[PDB]
Design a protein around this ligand. Structure first.
Ligand code: HEM
Ligand code: 278
Length: 292
C-alpha cells in the first residue's frame, strides 16, 4: 500500500534521456570483449529485470522505483551474483549523467540493451526516485531455477504477470549464458545470444534435450549442439498452457516482439504511480537510426 509517485528529474526531457541512452549504447559497442565477446547487452537486461523483480504487488515493496540495488543487502543477494558486472558498466554513465536516478539508469540500461541488440522498441518512462537504505527489500524475492511450471506460474502472480506475459518475458533467455560460478548452471541457450530474437522458443521446440547434471551437481537440460535450458525454461514446454504460447512465439517473430515490449515495460514500471500530467513514455532512437 506504499505509494511511489514518479517525479521527473528536474528540468529534463526526452533529449536528456536520449543522451544517456546513447552513452550506454556507445559503451555497449566499445566494450565488446566482455564475457568472451558476448558483450554487456545480456547482463544489462538481467540487471533491469532483477531490480524490478523484487516487487510485491501486495504491499508495493521492492520494485525498480527506489534504485535500491545500489545498497549492499541487495547487490550481495545470491540471486544477483554476476550483476555487479552490469553495475560496473553503468558507473561511468552515472558519473557523466549524475542527475539520473539509480532506478531510471538501471531500467534504461535494459531498454537500451534490448534495442541495440535489434530487439523491439521498449517505451520507457522517467521519474523513479532514489529511496533510503532501509527501503531495500530482503533477499529471496527473485525466482529459483530448479522448479516446475506451477512454481513459475505462482511466482509471477506476485509481479502481476499472467501466462502470456511470463512466456514472453522468458524469451529474454535467448540472451547471454548461464555461468556456473554465478548460478550453478552452465551454458548458452542458442547461437544467437547477443542479438534479440525468438530463438528461445525455436530451440525449446526443435533441439533434442537431455536431462543431465552439470559440474555443480544441478540438473539442466542439454543439447548436443552445446545449448542448455534451466528446469524453469523447460517447464514452459511441459505445461500445456505455456506450450501453446511457446509455439505461438516460435511461429511469429513480430508478435513475440510486441508482447515482450509490453511485458518488459510493465515489469520495469510495476509499483510506480505516474501523475496524469507526467510526460508520455519515451521511445528512444537506436544509434543505427541516428547514424551514430
Ligand atoms: C523463472 C524466472 C527466471 C529464472 C528462474 C531465471 C534464472 C536465470 C539464471 C539462473 C540465469 C543465469 C545467471 C548466470 O549464471 O549468470 C539467468 C540469466 C539471465 N536471465 Fe533469467 N531467470 C528468469 C527470468 C528472467 C526474465 C523475466 C528475464 C528478463 C526479461 C531474464 C533475463 C535474463 C538474462 C538476459 C540472462 C543472461 C545474463 C548473462 O548472460 O549475464 N530472466 N536467469
Ligand atoms: C541463456 N540463458 C539464460 C538463462 C537461461 C538460459 C539458457 N536457456
Amino acid at each position: 500500500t506504499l505509494v511511489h509517485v514518479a517525479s521527473v528529474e528536474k528540468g529534463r526531457s526526452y533529449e536528456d534521456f536520449q543522451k544517456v541512452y546513447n552513452a550506454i549504447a556507445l559503451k555497449l559497442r566499445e566494450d565488446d570483449e566482455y564475457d568472451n565477446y558476448i558483450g554487456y547487452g545480456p547482463v544489462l537486461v538481467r540487471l533491469a529485470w532483477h531490480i524490478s523483480g523484487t516487487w510485491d504487488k501486495h504491499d508495493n515493496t521492492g520494485g525498480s522505483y527506489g534504485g535500491t540495488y545500489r545498497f549492499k543487502k541487495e547487490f550481495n543477494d545470491p540471486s544477483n551474483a554476476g550483476l555487479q558486472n552490469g553495475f560496473k558498466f553503468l558507473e561511468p554513465i552515472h558519473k557523466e549523467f549524475p542527475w539520473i536516478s539509480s532506478g531510471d539508469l538501471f531500467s534504461l540500461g535494459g531498454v537500451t540493451a534490448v534495442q541495440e541488440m535489434q530487439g523491439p522498441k521498449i517505451p520507457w518512462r522517467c521519474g523513479r526516485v532514489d529511496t533510503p537504505e532501509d527501503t531495500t527489500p530482503d533477499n529471496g524475492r527473485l525466482p529459483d531455477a530448479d522448479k516446475d511450471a506451477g512454481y513459475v506460474r505462482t511466482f509471477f502472480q506476485r509481479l502481476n504477470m499472467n501466462d502470456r506475459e511470463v512466456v514472453a518475458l522468458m524469451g529474454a533467455h535467448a540472451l547471454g549464458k548461464t555461468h556456473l560460478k554465478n548460478s550453478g548452471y552452465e551454458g548458452p541457450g542458442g547461437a544467437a545470444n547477443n542479438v534479440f530474437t525468438n530463438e528461445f522458443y525455436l530451440n525449446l521446440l526443435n533441439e533434442d534435450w537431455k536431462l543431465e547434471k552439470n559440474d555443480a551437481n544441478n540438473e539442466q537440460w542439454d543439447s548436443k549442439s552445446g545449448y542448455m535450458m534451466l528446469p524453469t525454461d523447460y517447464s514452459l514446454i511441459q505445461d500445456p498452457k505455456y506450450l501453446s504460447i511457446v509455439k505461438e512465439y516460435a511461429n511469429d517473430q513480430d508478435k513475440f516482439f510486441k508482447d515482450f515490449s509490453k511485458a518488459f515495460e510493465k515489469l520495469l514500471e510495476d509499483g510506480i504511480t505516474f501523475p496524469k500530467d507526467a510526460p508520455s513514455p519515451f521511445i528512444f532512437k537506436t544509434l543505427e537510426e541516428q547514424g551514430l
